[PDB]
Every structure is written in C-alpha cells, then in structure tokens.
Amino acid sequence: VVSHFNDCPDSHTQFCFHGTCRFLVQEDKPACVCHSGYVGARCEHADLLA
C-alpha cells in the first residue's frame, strides 16, 4: 500500500501478452494486469475462451 510505480517496462513486461502493465518501483515487483475481452493464463489468448 501507499507505494507506487513508474517504469512498467523493465524486461519483466514480457509477463503479459496483451494487457495492463504495472511495476512497483519502491517495491520492485513486476506484474502486468490483463486487459479485457481477452483470454489465456496470462491473457495470451484473445476472446473465444469465455
């Protein structure tokens, strides 16, 4: 909490196929959120998998 982020891309950005990206600087923690209307374990697929 409180903590924030800035540089989303940092190599770890590869942890998302097509979704939101967010890297907690102060809390070095690479984590990219999905997007929407997509699919896949990490949002690799795009729809067709409701």
Contact 19, 44 (CB under 8 A): no
Structural determination approach: NMR
Contact 39, 45 (CB under 8 A): yes
SS3 of residue 31 by DSSP: strand
CATH placement of domain 1-50: 2.10.25.10
Burial 3-34 (b: 16+ CB within 10 A, else e): eebeebeeeeeeebbebebebeeeeeebebee
Angle at alpha carbon of residue 42, lines to 25 and 10, rounded to 5°: 30
Contact 20, 34 (CB under 8 A): yes
